[PDB]
């Protein structure tokens, strides 16, 4: 693929330069151009942190689904949605697999394995983002049309979780359709990377644009709208728990924003670098390089604990878990 021949300044310069003089400019010094040996995150740290992230995710999802399984009789649409979010450990397991195996077995690198590793990761990231908007919509419907009975139906929960899964699957399938196996050109080691051929630079803005507009901004706007309506309805009542439901709405929206914004800002901050809008330097690329890994790990961490902190904010779930702890301490000890 790449080749070169040392000129050696011999009788034949390997390019016929002795017979050509041309001209030379004045004395020039420094002006470093070639960039190499840039500080990047070690590949072992990513898998190491993701392993314990997966452990936390599976522990929380199991704890939530056990309590759902106990009190299955009196369950509403929101419980169904929260259980639907729990199909994430099964999506993260298939992504940690084919990557741990791929890390211990360098030869099992394949184009069909990179896409399987990235599709499940995208699905795991995107499922809860769209399953939370449905929770907000149900919460609005259960406060607006409070005297009716259809907002409390479980079929609504099943339909909404099916729609959320459909949207997440479509987004992941669109975003994963160009991963492939690429040989690195400074170390000649195979890896997974986007390979669109000649135009494998516009198929890095399309994925990023779809991720930011249809994965961050639209869910944020829908969440804000469906919670502002709920507050504007519940503000006019005389309930004592009026300042207790503001600290849940604000907490949920702020947590989503805080944990999902840095990854998207440190993608524009890199697209600008690729398009020559920020002065390029060796130190610049190397701050973004670790920032991308840190922010992606942050997003995965947030997506791993959505059901646990969504259920712990409620009082019924806290009562159930307190009773479970009492039963666990009374026996087994």
């Amino acid at each position: 693929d790449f080749l070169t021949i040392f000129l050696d300044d011999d009788e034949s310069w390997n390019e016929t330069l002795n017979m050509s003089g041309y001209d030379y400019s004045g004395n020039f010094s420094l002006e470093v151009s070639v960039c190499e040996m840039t500080t990047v995150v070690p590949y072992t740290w990513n898998v190491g942190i993701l392993s314990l992230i997966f452990l936390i995710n599976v522990l929380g999802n199991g704890l939530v689904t056990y309590i759902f399984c106990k009190h299955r009789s009196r369950a509403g649409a929101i419980d169904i949605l929260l259980l639907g979010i729990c199909l994430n450990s099964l999506c993260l397991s298939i992504s940690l697999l084919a990557e741990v195996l791929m890390f211990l077995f360098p030869n099992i690198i394949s184009t069909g394995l990179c896409r399987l590793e990235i599709f499940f990761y995208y699905l795991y990231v995107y499922l809860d983002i769209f399953s939370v908007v449905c929770v907000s919509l149900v919460r609005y419907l259960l406060v607006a049309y409070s005297t009716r009975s259809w907002p409390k139906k479980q079929s609504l929960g099943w339909v909404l979780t099916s729609a959320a899964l459909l949207i997440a699957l479509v987004l992941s399938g669109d975003a994963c359709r160009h991963r492939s196996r690429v040989v690195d050109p400074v170390s000649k080691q195979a890896m997974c990377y986007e390979n669109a051929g000649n135009m494998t630079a516009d198929w890095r803005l399309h994925v990023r644009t779809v991720s930011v507009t249809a994965g961050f901004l639209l869910p944020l706007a829908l969440l804000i709208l469906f919670y502002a309506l709920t507050w504007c309805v519940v503000r006019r009542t005389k309930l004592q728990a009026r300042r207790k439901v503001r600290g849940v709405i604000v907490a949920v929206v702020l947590l989503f924003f805080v944990f999902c914004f840095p990854y998207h800002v440190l993608n524009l901050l890199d697209t600008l670098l690729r398009r020559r809008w920020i002065r390029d330097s060796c130190y610049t690329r190397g701050l973004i390089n670790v920032g991308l890994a840190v922010t992606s790990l942050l997003q995965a961490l947030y997506s791993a604990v959505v059901p646990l902190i969504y259920s712990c904010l409620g009082s019924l779930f806290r009562q159930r878990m307190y009773g479970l702890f009492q039963s666990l301490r009374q026996s087994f000890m």
């Binding site: 149900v138 409070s146 005297t147 009975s149 009542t237 309930l239 004592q240 969504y310």
Partner: protein
């Protein structure tokens, strides 16, 4: 997987779906429990609600509809047995419609051992409000007979009841004092709400108040079910 056992599972599913359909129809009704003293105005409240829909003692149900909402109101006055043995039956009622007659701060009970009727009503209110079965149930307090109150609030001073009182023998600052005295008996003031209203013989302003309170109660129940919180 038999022949005679097939018309024993389809029948069970018939019954199960009929029960499911009947169980969600009874969840759209508002069930209220009426309580009051020996004579506070419960009968006049029942008359005011204008029942529309639909030895032998005990429960006296009363069904009515206001702005597409069915209320069933259970009055327990014919049950003179012990209260602790059946008061836990009404553990899931929407609200309580405790009634107190304002013009009772001068008289005494017919049992004739000289206690104030208002004090006895307060004792019953604080014995019902602070109960194990009713820890989140909202209370709708009616203070009837405000027309008769502005007959005895002039000649008779309040000092007969609540001797510590800061004067001002008029209608205002005396009905508010009674309202505050009744609402001070709440031991869960940060979780449980009390909706007070002076009713007298007002017309179509009592069922509206009950509707306005049960709307908030239903919204609170839905909030608790949702996960908000």
């Amino acid at each position: 997987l038999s022949a005679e056992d097939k018309a024993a599972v389809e029948r069970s599913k018939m019954i199960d779906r009929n029960l499911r359909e009947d169980g969600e129809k009874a969840a759209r009704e508002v069930k209220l429990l009426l309580l009051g003293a020996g004579e506070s105005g419960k009968s006049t409240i029942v008359k005011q609600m204008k029942i529309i829909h639909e030895k032998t003692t005990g429960i006296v149900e009363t069904h009515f509809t206001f702005k597409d909402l069915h209320f069933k109101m259970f009055d327990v006055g014919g049950q003179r047995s012990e209260r602790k043995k059946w008061i836990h039956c009404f553990e899931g009622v929407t609200a309580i419609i405790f009634c107190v007659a304002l013009s009772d701060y001068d008289l005494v009970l017919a049992e004739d051992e000289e206690m104030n009727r208002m004090h006895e009503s307060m004792k019953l209110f604080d014995s019902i409000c602070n109960n194990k079965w009713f820890t989140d149930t909202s209370i709708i307090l009616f203070l009837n007979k405000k027309d008769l109150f502005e007959e005895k609030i002039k000649k008779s001073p309040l000092t007969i009841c609540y001797p510590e009182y800061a004067g001002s023998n008029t209608y205002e600052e005396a009905a508010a004092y009674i309202q505050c005295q009744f609402e001070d008996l709440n031991k869960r003031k940060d979780t449980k709400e009390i909706y007070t209203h002076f009713t007298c013989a007002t017309d179509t302003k009592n069922v509206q108040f009950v509707f306005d309170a049960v709307t908030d109660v239903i919204i609170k129940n839905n909030l608790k079910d949702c996960g908000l919180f």
